[PDB]
Design an enzyme around this catalytic site. Structure first.
Site, PDB file in Angstrom:
ATOM      1  N   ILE A  64       0.798  -1.244   0.000  1.00  0.00           N
ATOM      2  CA  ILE A  64       0.000   0.000   0.000  1.00  0.00           C
ATOM      3  C   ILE A  64       0.827   1.290   0.000  1.00  0.00           C
ATOM      4  O   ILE A  64       0.273   2.385   0.067  1.00  0.00           O
ATOM      5  CB  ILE A  64      -0.969   0.047   1.208  1.00  0.00           C
ATOM      6  CG1 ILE A  64      -0.210  -0.111   2.537  1.00  0.00           C
ATOM      7  CG2 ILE A  64      -2.037  -1.026   1.072  1.00  0.00           C
ATOM      8  CD1 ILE A  64      -1.026   0.246   3.764  1.00  0.00           C
ATOM      9  N   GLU A  80      -1.565   2.010  13.035  1.00  0.00           N
ATOM     10  CA  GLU A  80      -3.002   1.919  12.823  1.00  0.00           C
ATOM     11  C   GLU A  80      -3.276   2.030  11.330  1.00  0.00           C
ATOM     12  O   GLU A  80      -2.537   2.698  10.602  1.00  0.00           O
ATOM     13  CB  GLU A  80      -3.736   3.041  13.565  1.00  0.00           C
ATOM     14  CG  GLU A  80      -3.463   4.444  13.016  1.00  0.00           C
ATOM     15  CD  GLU A  80      -3.859   5.549  13.978  1.00  0.00           C
ATOM     16  OE1 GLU A  80      -4.829   5.355  14.738  1.00  0.00           O
ATOM     17  OE2 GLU A  80      -3.210   6.616  13.964  1.00  0.00           O
ATOM     18  N   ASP A 108       8.961  17.739   6.478  1.00  0.00           N
ATOM     19  CA  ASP A 108       8.502  17.368   5.124  1.00  0.00           C
ATOM     20  C   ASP A 108       6.969  17.161   5.048  1.00  0.00           C
ATOM     21  O   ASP A 108       6.506  16.103   4.617  1.00  0.00           O
ATOM     22  CB  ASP A 108       9.219  16.092   4.631  1.00  0.00           C
ATOM     23  CG  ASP A 108       8.901  15.750   3.176  1.00  0.00           C
ATOM     24  OD1 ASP A 108       8.518  16.663   2.413  1.00  0.00           O
ATOM     25  OD2 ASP A 108       9.016  14.563   2.794  1.00  0.00           O
TER      26      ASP A 108
HETATM   27  C1  ZC3 Z   1       3.969   6.447   5.106  1.00  0.00           C
HETATM   28  C2  ZC3 Z   1       4.819   6.301   6.370  1.00  0.00           C
HETATM   29  O1  ZC3 Z   1       5.955   6.766   6.429  1.00  0.00           O
HETATM   30  N1  ZC3 Z   1       4.240   5.632   7.376  1.00  0.00           N
HETATM   31  C3  ZC3 Z   1       2.996   5.193   7.193  1.00  0.00           C
HETATM   32  N2  ZC3 Z   1       2.337   5.142   6.035  1.00  0.00           N
HETATM   33  C4  ZC3 Z   1       1.080   4.657   6.141  1.00  0.00           C
HETATM   34  C5  ZC3 Z   1       0.181   4.484   5.168  1.00  0.00           C
HETATM   35  C6  ZC3 Z   1      -1.080   3.972   5.441  1.00  0.00           C
HETATM   36  F1  ZC3 Z   1      -2.027   3.792   4.418  1.00  0.00           F
HETATM   37  C7  ZC3 Z   1      -1.392   3.641   6.746  1.00  0.00           C
HETATM   38  C8  ZC3 Z   1      -0.435   3.836   7.727  1.00  0.00           C
HETATM   39  C9  ZC3 Z   1       0.757   4.329   7.410  1.00  0.00           C
HETATM   40  S1  ZC3 Z   1       2.053   4.656   8.361  1.00  0.00           S
END
Ligand code: ZC3
Length: 342
Positions: free
Chosen positions: A32, A106, A154
């Site tokens: 994702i 989460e 950032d």
């Molecule tokens: C993107 C990053 O550096 N950390 C996280 N990225 C996400 C992306 C999601 F869809 C859900 C939780 C987190 S935590």
């Protein structure tokens, strides 16, 4: 040929596999997210019985190290919450798995970038801008707790995720670029569009640079497009100069990188360097937001809460965030008490 007994690849990244179970606990769904750090997978924690996002860090000493600085900052912030009423993303736990530091967050929904795309870069209401605006502002007040005093360093639409796809609650994510206020170590910081004047000019920065990043983030959410979309630092600075004017002389006289963008004439005053751009301060924000012309491109004309009155409260707040002087630029606490949030 093979890396880490077949679990990694060229890039030191774990090969995600639909269906795989970790530690007889996390049922791995799908990939994702992706970046420098490594890969974010969606997974079902069987013990707490819930979806979780897992941030799988690359099997490399450099990424693990910056990832352990993240864990430090998240865990720190988390023990000044316990309730979770300050819009920072929650770190639940972290374990090593096949020589990868995995951070378990989460599960959240779309990021504010995906929403822009969902409008076709035409943006969302001022009523919705205001709710991100209040939340985002409460998060800078939280970070600014003197023992925390954390610079995210950032902020962008796509580092801001909605908790739910049917609510307007937001969470800031990704604290690997972040660090606590200190002596100046780094200078090429912030994503370019949301890079402070002080960074571009090579001056010392504080928590205020996050406020600039909010100001430009907030306007792009309502218009649907970056306020300052630079292709290169020179072209970034020029687009800010369009909207706000030449930076005050007492600021340029201090800047080690003043001459990358401006030039000190014999008299003491500063002017731009010929390289296109409207004359300094003539791309007025009053106009870009369509305050007296039905909003961004006239598309908000008639809609409730989009009057001239509503828009000027929005403007003045945006102007205090895009303040050139990092010390008079508005702070989270007084930003929350601006009329825009009445
Ligand atoms: C993107 C990053 O550096 N950390 C996280 N990225 C996400 C992306 C999601 F869809 C859900 C939780 C987190 S935590």
């Amino acid at each position: 040929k093979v890396y880490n007994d077949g679990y990694d690849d060229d890039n030191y990244d774990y090969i995600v596999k639909n269906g795989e179970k970790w530690m007889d606990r996390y049922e791995i769904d799908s990939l994702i997210g992706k970046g420098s750090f490594g890969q974010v997978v969606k997974a079902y924690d069987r013990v707490e019985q819930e979806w979780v996002a897992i941030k799988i860090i690359k099997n490399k000493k450099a990424f693990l190290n910056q990832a352990q600085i993240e864990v430090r900052l998240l865990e720190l912030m988390n023990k000044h919450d316990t309730e979770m009423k300050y819009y920072i993303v929650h770190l639940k736990r972290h374990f090593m798995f096949r020589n990868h530091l995995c951070l378990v967050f989460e599960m959240l929904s779309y990021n504010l970038y995906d929403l822009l795309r969902n409008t076709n870069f035409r943006g969302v209401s001022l009523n919705l801008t205001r709710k991100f605006a209040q939340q985002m502002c409460t998060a800078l007040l939280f970070l600014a707790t003197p023992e925390l005093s954390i610079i995210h360093c950032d902020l962008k639409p796509e580092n801001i995720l909605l908790c739910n796809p049917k609510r307007s609650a937001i969470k800031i994510v990704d604290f690997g670029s972040s660090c606590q206020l200190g002596q100046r170590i780094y200078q090429y910081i912030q994503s370019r569009f949301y890079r402070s004047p002080e960074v571009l000019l090579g001056m010392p920065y504080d928590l205020a640079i996050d406020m600039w990043s909010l100001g430009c983030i907030l306007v792009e959410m309502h218009t649907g497009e970056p306020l300052f979309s630079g292709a290169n630092e020179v072209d970034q600075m020029n687009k800010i100069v369009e909207v706000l004017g030449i930076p005050p002389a007492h600021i340029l006289d201090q800047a080690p990188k003043a001459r990358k963008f401006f030039e000190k004439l014999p008299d003491g005053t500063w002017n731009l360097k010929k390289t296109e751009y409207k004359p300094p301060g003539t791309r007025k924000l009053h106009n870009i937001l369509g305050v007296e012309t039905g909003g961004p491109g006239g598309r908000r004309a008639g809609e409730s809460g989009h009057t001239v009155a509503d828009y000027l409260k929005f403007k003045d707040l945006i102007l205090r965030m895009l303040d050139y002087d990092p010390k008079t630029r508005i702070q989270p606490y007084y930003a929350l008490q601006h009329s825009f949030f009445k």
